[PDB]
Amino acid sequence: SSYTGAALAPKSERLRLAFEEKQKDHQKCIEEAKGKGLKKDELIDACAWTHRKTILALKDWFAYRPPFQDRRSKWAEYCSIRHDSGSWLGWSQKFF
Amino acid sequence: AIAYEVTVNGANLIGAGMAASGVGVPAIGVAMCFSSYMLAAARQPNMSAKLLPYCILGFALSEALALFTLLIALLELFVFS
Amino acid sequence: AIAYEVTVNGANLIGAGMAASGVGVPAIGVAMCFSSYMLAAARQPNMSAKLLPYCILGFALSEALALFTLLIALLELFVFS
Amino acid sequence: AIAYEVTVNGANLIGAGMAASGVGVPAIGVAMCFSSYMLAAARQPNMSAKLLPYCILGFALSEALALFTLLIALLELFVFS
Amino acid sequence: AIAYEVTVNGANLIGAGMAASGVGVPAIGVAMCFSSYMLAAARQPNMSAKLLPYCILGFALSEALALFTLLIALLELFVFS
Amino acid sequence: AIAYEVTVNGANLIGAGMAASGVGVPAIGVAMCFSSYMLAAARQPNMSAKLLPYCILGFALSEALALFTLLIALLELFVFS
Amino acid sequence: AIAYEVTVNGANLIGAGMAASGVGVPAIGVAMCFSSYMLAAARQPNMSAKLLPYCILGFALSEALALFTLLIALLELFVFS
Amino acid sequence: AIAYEVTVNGANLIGAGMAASGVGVPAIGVAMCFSSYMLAAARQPNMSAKLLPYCILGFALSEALALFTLLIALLELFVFS
Amino acid sequence: AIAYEVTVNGANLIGAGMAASGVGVPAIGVAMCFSSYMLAAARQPNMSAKLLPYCILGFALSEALALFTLLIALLELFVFS
Amino acid sequence: AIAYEVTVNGANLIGAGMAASGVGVPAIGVAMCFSSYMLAAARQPNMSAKLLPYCILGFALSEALALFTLLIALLELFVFS
Amino acid sequence: SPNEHLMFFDFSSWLLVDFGKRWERWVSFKKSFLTTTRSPYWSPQFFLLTFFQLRNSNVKLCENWNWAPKGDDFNLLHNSAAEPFGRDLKAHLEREAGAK
Amino acid sequence: NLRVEWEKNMEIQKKLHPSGLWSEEQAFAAAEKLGRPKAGHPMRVFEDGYQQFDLKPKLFDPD
Amino acid sequence: SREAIFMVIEERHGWDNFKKLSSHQQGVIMQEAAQESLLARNKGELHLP
Amino acid sequence: IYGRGSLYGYRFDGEIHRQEAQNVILYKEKEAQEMAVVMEKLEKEIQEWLKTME
Numbered sequence A: 001s002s003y004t005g006a007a008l009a010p011k012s013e014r015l016r017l018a019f020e021e022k023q024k025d026h027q028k029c030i031e032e033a034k035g036k037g038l039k040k041d042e043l044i045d046a047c048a049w050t051h052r053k054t055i056l057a058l059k060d061w062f063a064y065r066p067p068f069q070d071r072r073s074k075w076a077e078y079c080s081i082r083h084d085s086g087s088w089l090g091w092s093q094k095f096f
Numbered sequence B, C, D, E, F, G, H, I, J: 001a002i003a004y005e006v007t008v009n010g011a012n013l014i015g016a017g018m019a020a021s022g023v024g025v026p027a028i029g030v031a032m033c034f035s036s037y038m039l040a041a042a043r044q045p046n047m048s049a050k051l052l053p054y055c056i057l058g059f060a061l062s063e064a065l066a067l068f069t070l071l072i073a074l075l076e077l078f079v080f081s
Numbered sequence K: 001s002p003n004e005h006l007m008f009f010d011f012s013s014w015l016l017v018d019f020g021k022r023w024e025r026w027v028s029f030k031k032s033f034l035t036t037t038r039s040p041y042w043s044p045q046f047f048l049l050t051f052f053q054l055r056n057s058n059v060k061l062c063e064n065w066n067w068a069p070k071g072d073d074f075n076l077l078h079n080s081a082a083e084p085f086g087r088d089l090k091a092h093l094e095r096e097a098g099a100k
Numbered sequence L: 001n002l003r004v005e006w007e008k009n010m011e012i013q014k015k016l017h018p019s020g021l022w023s024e025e026q027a028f029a030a031a032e033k034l035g036r037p038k039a040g041h042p043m044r045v046f047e048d049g050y051q052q053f054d055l056k057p058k059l060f061d062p063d
Numbered sequence M: 001s002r003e004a005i006f007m008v009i010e011e012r013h014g015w016d017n018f019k020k021l022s023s024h025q026q027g028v029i030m031q032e033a034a035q036e037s038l039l040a041r042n043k044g045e046l047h048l049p
Numbered sequence N: 001i002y003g004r005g006s007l008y009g010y011r012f013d014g015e016i017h018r019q020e021a022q023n024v025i026l027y028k029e030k031e032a033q034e035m036a037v038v039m040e041k042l043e044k045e046i047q048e049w050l051k052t053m054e
């Protein structure tokens, strides 16, 4: 069967595993270029795609900060609501 | 869970009957225009010339919907396996 | 996933009735055209000659959609396997 | 993919129900056609003689549509397996 | 492709209701004819005798299609296995 | 070919609803007959006594068709397995 | 419990006919507008200019729903696999 | 007893076709309203403006019901997985 | 006999297109009320004020059935799995 | 012969939509009563008081059948499994 | 073809824009303008050119969401897992037996 | 008539693919005959930004 | 021209295979053979012995 | 010439195209010969399963 529910792994672990997968997919391209006997410029033209994918995974990982623990976040956990414990105004803090 | 794709070839035709069944409903609207022109000229013969363009216009429009319905029935068969 | 192609031979014959159901709907429009022309003539006998052309026009042409509603059912059986 | 041909013998009969459902529709145009001749004769008895051909013409075509639908229903069973 | 003939005994009975739904469609044309005769009588009492032959006629032929539609569903059961 | 016979007991009760769908259509013919008798008597009360049999006639014939449809649905269950 | 996902590809082309049956049901209402415009001008030709907006206004709206009914059946095939 | 869950993905579309068949029935009520406005204006031109608010009110909350049906048919596909 | 329970999840949605098909058939009844109001005002202009109380009452309660017919289709989906 | 028992749970929610399709069919006959009341009041406003007892009676008891059709589909779900 | 008539293939090229580099050069141009003009903090120039950027950055660094957005961290479709009893465990043991 | 008869006879004896369908055995045999690469599945549904508007995406699973 | 055409055909393709092919491809190959003979690349483009 | 579409002669005619009818005849004979064996085998298997259980 199937179910609509929560994500299995945390965001940080998900991004970590994605970065590892792109590292593998880039290492394979690099090993293949080395087996073919390509130079630096040809290796660049070969594996620039996987390099950019790895860099984007790294950007996502660096961009995601795990949340800090405090009384407001714990109360939001108890209330089971998506809540930002860094805003005095909510949706208007985006414009204020 | 398990996943069974099924391709029912018989369904190439079951819809064609329904599409064919809906071609005859506009025919009443088709004849409703000529009937209207008939009764209109039967109440005012002199106006028969000025309402004939409306009569031809309405026949085509009512007929077109039946004709539009027909496209699905003919498109359902001669290309789909 | 798995793929089971099926050929439903019964659908060759099921659709025949499905199209056949729509063959009698145009009859109401067809008879309507005459039910108009009668009353129009009873309203004005002298104009009977000018409405007769537009009395057979819609007559046969509503039956034409009935014909294409019937031509599918006859094209459904004696050619398809 | 796998290929299962099936021949459903029960479907020899299902279409006959839908055809029989469509045999009764033209009865409306039948009654509308005799009714129009009735009312037109009540409004003008002297004209009743030359509206009779129009009445029988409309009824015969409408009945033919019913007959064709019924013919499909009866041909569907006594010859097909 | 593999060939599985199947005989569905349940379909012996389904079509009976489907034609049974078509047995009521002429019943409105029945009263359309009788109402036509009634209103033509109120239009002209003196013509009541001359339109009665088209009453019983205009019913029975419309009733005939209601019989055949009813005939099939009753023929559908006590002979078909 | 291989011969698989199936007996669907569920079809005992589906066709009863399929027939039950059509039981309400003759009620419109019933009310049409009575409406015609009412408007005709309001047009000419003297003719009321002459149209009373016709009214009783036009109901019963329409009603009979409904009864036949209803009978099938009740004959479908208490005798069949 | 057990879970069998099935992807019925025949419903891609069944619903096309099921929607196609309804594309003509607006047409009988479409022709009502032009019939009304005809008879209204037959009652008063001088008003035919002031009602003609309401005539065009009455067509494109009544025609629109037919088009919307036609959209789904064409949305059903040329995008879904 | 053993529990066999199934998820029929073809059922995402059958209802969409049925609702699509139902989107057209308000179209005759639109031209019914506008035909009423036409005949009322031809009967009495001076009342052309007082019934124009009702000419708009009759269309708005009539076409809306066509839209609720159409809203289901398009909501039936582009949100359900 | 062995008990094979099946839970068809596709069946959550097919009924929604049927209820949606029944959301349209009140619209003709809705527009009938305003059509009657229009022709009634064209029959008696100054009476238009004392009929409007008897015009909204037929509007809402005809609309009300559509809501309940529309209610099921929305209650069929957003709560059922 | 072998006895395979199946309990289709989705049919419990299919029949909800099936009965839902018939909840709006009365609505035309609900607003028809007030339509007739409007035309009769326009014919003779002094009679408007004598008719409204025979209006509400014909109104509610035309509405009542819709309730009997609606209750089924609502009793179909919150108790049945 | 009709779809070919309902198609627009009159494109010429793809304009590629590094919005990150463009944002960097915009900020550099703002800094260069403010340095060349030697404008104070109370200027409307300085306000318009600095305050909204600082406000949005401060908000995006102050944000401490207990949970990520809707379609990124939950409400996701997941296949049902194998149970430790009944048929799934039997299939698991049969797999272990066949493999070993 | 000649064209469709020949095409039908070849579709019957499986020397030619059926009308509108890509057949696997015939395509692989033709590739082996012409010495060309075999028809693979070059699409990438899990590529970044292909099924973002898809409410029912496809799940990655190492078979 | 027929003599040279069918000489070329029977040398390059064969008379049996040529008869087995279609009339269109037959005519095409005949035209190619006619061009080869009219050209006469081996005689220095000269129809002499 | 205009209807054929070719200026020299017809296409898909010749013994290479006519032989496909005989090839189809032989292929259908072989296919029916194998299908009868397979159907008899499956029918024997099913009659075994039924007469063992039912």
Ligand SMILES: CCCCCCCCCCCCO[C@@H]1O[C@H](CO)[C@@H](O[C@H]2O[C@H](CO)[C@@H](O)[C@H](O)[C@H]2O)[C@H](O)[C@H]1O
Pocket: K019, K020, K023, K056
């Ligand atoms: C002629 C038609 C086109 C006219 C276009 C003119 C648009 C003018 C509006 C510019 C809007 C400024 O909006 C600003 O955009 C930048 C990126 O550009 C966003 O910036 C965001 O993305 C950039 C890179 O993509 C990151 O480096 C940055 O840290 C992040 O905040 C800002 O958060 C937003 O505030």
Ligand SMILES: COCCOCCOCCOc1ccc(C(C)(C)CC(C)(C)C)cc1
Pocket: I078, I079, I080
């Ligand atoms: C401004 O618009 C108002 C916002 O509308 C909110 C949407 O409606 C509330 C839906 O929220 C849910 C979701 C799921 C459920 C569950 C699954 C718990 C209900 C259930 C078990 C009956 C199916 C209940 C409520």
